Ligand binder design. Structure first.
Ligand code: CL
Ligand code: CL
Ligand code: ZN
Ligand code: ZN
Lengths: 27, 21, 28, 21, 28, 21, 28, 21, 29, 21, 28, 21
């Protein structure tokens, strides 16, 4: 389950970092 | 992917930003 | 306030869960 | 879009699902 | 959607607070 | 319920603990 | 420890998935 | 229990729904 | 105020990722 | 403080960085 | 590795709720 | 510190309170 947990925190950080720009998440 | 990249070792917010639109 | 910003944080977590192996593309 | 639809009123897993890839 | 968002934080809090006892969560 | 007790004024640890099994 | 952290994401997932029915979290 | 089934391998939404009330 | 409590939880999350190994001391008041 | 600044308007990484140690 | 960065994220969230108005000096 | 202590084994709330100001 490690990878799945990491991705969850990774989207939260992209959301913060990327702002108005958004981001494509594509495992 | 970001996954292979940032779930193997810690990406900073500078590295993360490379993945923005 | 910053109600949208806070909501959006939760929405992305929800897409991450719902969309699964598929991923998703976020933009406001 | 999503923010205006899902942050003004609640979206279930059902209507979040189409916003996927 | 303030109640939904607040509810997400409260389940996170109950999880920490209740530990192996668990808790019931019903939004009524 | 907990939404009504805890989503306007902040519930303490003690108050939260009332909801555990 | 991995399981304790996983446990926190589970109850958030339950919260989202179960909607108005809710859920009873019992760990064991 | 859920911890054993879902914190060892990834649970799908269908699998999570089973633990709903 | 719970709105402030909720916003703080996100703020502490942000500062964790932004501050890196320097750390932070979260003060609301 | 951080609340007045960043709970009324969205703070950028740079504004938030001002509250690091 | 990334596991510590993830745990630390959960710890700060826990210390925010546990410590209340006292706060906490997070220093990694 | 906290990491060394609370990311090896699970800390209880009372243990986590050790790290409050
Ligand atoms: Cl985690
Ligand atoms: Cl929120
Ligand atoms: Zn929130
Ligand atoms: Zn986590």
């Amino acid at each position: 389950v490690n990878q799945h947990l990491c991705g969850s925190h990774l989207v939260e950080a992209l959301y913060l970092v990327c702002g108005e720009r958004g981001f494509f998440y594509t495992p | 992917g970001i996954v292979e990249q940032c779930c193997t070792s810690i990406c900073s917010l500078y590295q993360l930003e490379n993945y923005c639109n």
